[PDB]
Design a protein around this ligand. Structure first.
Ligand SMILES: CN[C@@H]1[C@@H](O)[C@@H](O[C@@H]2[C@@H](O)[C@H](O[C@H]3OC(CN)=CC[C@H]3N)[C@@H](N)C[C@H]2N)OC[C@]1(C)O
Ligand SMILES: [Mg+2]
Length: 267
């Protein structure tokens, strides 16, 4: 039988989601199973669970981010530079590889979207505008990003059937860790700057592997290795949401752990 909004809200409350919480979900819809009115049912359940004073923050990115095509160039190649659509936060679809639920979050009425085309975050709730801005090129997941404000706002990570590699907030630990040899990438994004398309070239920490040994195309990256160690060592609320095994993680706690994990292992 497909899961109803009411059943999912009960499960989320049993897991520990409280009215007023600040939640960042990572969702595998296949693990959840069938939903009364499709994925919107889970979106509706999350909003009801955090209540009218709570907030949801999601890493949605952009279906058509030209990351691969501009990576490692000092400027966008001529072909992509002339024809690539500028990032339009109001209409740009979410990146499907990070979860099919994110397109439903970002089109939710009142949802705010951050300005970073590749690292775009979406937020719902009274603190949404404060969460999503600023989000500047060069500050994808580190200090001054929405992730940083999420961590300072008692954020909780809600993993619904997602694996330990999916914990975006741990890229903040990579950004701030005092370790040698940190990898950086250069890429270009097409922004809308008062109506006109402008290409911006920036560098930032490599979110596909902060060090060479975490950068194999098949992982495990540092996010995954940190999260596995953390979950083996920490009491974490665990339970079902629909058919999916779910966890509710204190975001500040796992990031602090990840900073220490990286700094203990790399001089
Ligand atoms: C939309 N543009 C995207 C661009 O943002 C970036 O995505 C990163 C992403 O794959 C990382 O997730 C993968 O990590 C690894 C091992 N590296 C394999 C499986 C995933 N867990 C995530 N942790 C950080 C993301 N920024 O590279 C790909 C891209 C499609 O170009
Ligand atoms: Mg508030």
């Amino acid at each position: 039988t497909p899961w109803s909004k009411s059943e999912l809200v009960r499960q989320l409350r049993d897991l520990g989601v409280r009215s007023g919480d600040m939640v960042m979900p990572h969702v595998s819809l296949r693990a959840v199973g069938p939903l009364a009115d499709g994925p919107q049912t889970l979106v509706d359940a999350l909003i009801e669970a955090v209540g009218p004073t709570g907030n949801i923050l999601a890493f949605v990115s952009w279906r058509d981010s030209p990351y691969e095509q501009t990576l490692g160039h000092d400027a966008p190649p001529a072909a992509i530079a002339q024809s690539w659509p500028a990032f339009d936060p109001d209409h740009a679809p979410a990146y499907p590889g990070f979860g099919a639920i994110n397109e439903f979050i970002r089109t939710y009425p009142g949802c705010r979207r951050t300005a970073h085309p590749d690292a775009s975050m979406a937020a719902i709730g009274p603190d949404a505008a404060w969460l999503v801005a600023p989000h500047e090129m060069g500050a994808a997941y580190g200090p001054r990003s929405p992730i940083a404000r999420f961590l300072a706002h008692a954020g909780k990570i809600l993993s619904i059937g997602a694996g330990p590699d999916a914990v975006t907030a741990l890229h903040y630990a990579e950004a701030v860790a005092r370790i040698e040899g940190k990898r950086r990438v250069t890429y270009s994004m097409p922004l809308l700057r008062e109506g006109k398309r402008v290409w911006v070239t920036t560098s930032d920490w490599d979110s596909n592997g902060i060090l060479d040994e975490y950068a194999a195309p098949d992982g495990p990256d540092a996010v995954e290795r940190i999260a596995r160690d953390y979950l083996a060592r920490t009491r974490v609320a665990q339970g079902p949401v629909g058919g999916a095994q779910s966890r509710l993680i204190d975001a500040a706690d796992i990031v602090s752990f990840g900073i220490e994990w990286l700094e203990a292992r790399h001089a």
